[PDB]
Amino acid sequence: MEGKMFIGGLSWDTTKKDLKDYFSKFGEVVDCTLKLDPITGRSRGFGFVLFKESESVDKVMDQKEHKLNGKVIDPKRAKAMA
Amino acid sequence: MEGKMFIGGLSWDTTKKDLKDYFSKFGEVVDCTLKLDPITGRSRGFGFVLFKESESVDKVMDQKEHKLNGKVIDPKRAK
């Protein structure tokens, strides 16, 4: 089954391509997004990743250190969202 | 803050103590229960867990899968 993640802490200069390239380290990424302010475009500071295989989510969680564009980021399982 | 969870999908043989023992690995459990039908007293096949610290709920939700008595169970935030 596909596996979905919420990604917090994304730097303001992070692009969708940045996000896709990074999480491709863990397997095939079906899609990924930044969440944008619909009015200003200010990076809300988080994004989402949709993996082809949910085992990829396990591999992300297994790895302790995630950094992207010089900022520590925080991948979470979708089910963990409040 | 405390953290309250709904625990779905419990096996018929799961006890209150099973719940306490299993979820205690994520942090202190204040209490936990097997829910019963308020009229018939019949098992509802799910339970509740009250963690002393809400952090424990986050730890539970970081885990790939939860298995108890051979069965995959389904912890949810109580809301």
Author numbering:
A (entry chain B): 76 to 157
B (entry chain A): 76 to 154
The authors write:
Heterogeneous nuclear ribonucleoprotein D0 (hnRNP D0), also known as AU-rich element RNA-binding protein 1 (AUF1), is a well-characterized ARE-binding factor that destabilizes mRNA, while human (Hu) antigen proteins of the ELAV (embryonic lethal, abnormal vision) family are known to stabilize mRNA. AUF1 has four isoforms, p37, p40, p42, and p45, generated by alternative splicing. AUF1 contains two tandem RRMs and an adjacent Q-rich motif.
A selected AUF1-p37RRMs crystal was diffracted to a resolution of 1.7 Å and belonged to space group P212121. Consequently, we produced selenomethionine-substituted crystals using similar conditions and experimental SAD phasing succeeded using the AutoSol pipeline in the Phenix program. However, after refinement we realized that the two models of RRMs were identical because they had the same sequences as RRM1. The PISA analysis, based on the calculated interface area of 374.2 Å2 for the two RRM1 molecules, indicates that the arrangement of RRM1 dimer is most likely generated by crystallographic packing. Taken together, these results suggest that the linker between the RRM1 and RRM2 AUF1-p372RRMs proteins was cleaved by a certain protease, possibly a serine protease, and the free RRM1 fragment was specifically crystallized 1 or 2 days later.
